Design a protein around this ligand. Sequence first.
Ligand SMILES: CC1=C(C(=O)O)N2C(=O)[C@@H](NC(=O)CCC[C@@H](N)C(=O)O)[C@H]2SC1
Ligand SMILES: [Fe+3]
Length: 275
Amino acid sequence: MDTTVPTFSLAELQQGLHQDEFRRCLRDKGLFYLTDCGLTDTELKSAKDLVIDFFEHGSEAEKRAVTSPVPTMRRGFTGLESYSMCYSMGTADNLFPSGDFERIWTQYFDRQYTASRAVAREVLRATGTEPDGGVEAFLDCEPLLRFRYFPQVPLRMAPHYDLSMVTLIQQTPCANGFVSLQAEVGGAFTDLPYRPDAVLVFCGAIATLVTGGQVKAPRHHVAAPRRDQIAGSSRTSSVFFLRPNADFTFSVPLARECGFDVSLDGETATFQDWI
Ligand SMILES: CC1=C(C(=O)O)N2C(=O)[C@@H](NC(=O)CCC[C@@H](N)C(=O)O)[C@H]2SC1
Ligand SMILES: [Fe+3]
């Protein structure tokens, strides 16, 4: 039936405006684009620009000394060695190629994090939800950002819900129109392109959980291009996962009620256990 994906100014929402629509969008299709939340395509494009700079012009040497040590616990670069390169950050223990990089990308992270907190904060106020220990404690959490860059100019994974409170995507488009990102919206698969001055927001499982089921975490997937769509497909994505502190808590009879792969037992549980 209904597949459209709505847009909102965060400033306007904070001014009480559009209350019902925003409420229903959460509960029935857990996603949306978002203007006026103190992110800018310029900031994004300046960050992108210096990573690709390093991709292209760094020695074997500087890379090695800041490529991922533990390959799966996640800080630094991957997939740059002689299809997808990828940079990761967090609150700390980060790895940086130069001094100026550190600044630009530390600020880029902060701005992201602040925005993430804001929208999240709004998501709670809107469901009249007030987490155990406080809205702020909860929002002071252990977040993670992953940037991807697909350069140069066929297996199909299954959709997933994100293991997050909210997730913010900023993407750059392909020179040829192809959208990698799609989601289940009222029965169907809707494209999720780059929109100018906007930023995409998935609600995540944690959102659903903390609001006592009031908010939907949409299943989404990231397609590759068919072996004929390859020319003009360089793209990037900036994906900021707003993950809680290890010790957040949730009643497991509530959890499975929304179709969540949890092979653990007992009374309630915690975020650390689950990942
Ligand atoms: C959303 C998203 C993206 C992405 O590039 O956008 N990718 C990342 O940053 C990724 N994170 C990982 O590599 C873990 C893989 C998750 C899943 N395959 C599993 O272990 O059972 C993926 S999965 C999450
Ligand atoms: Fe995802």
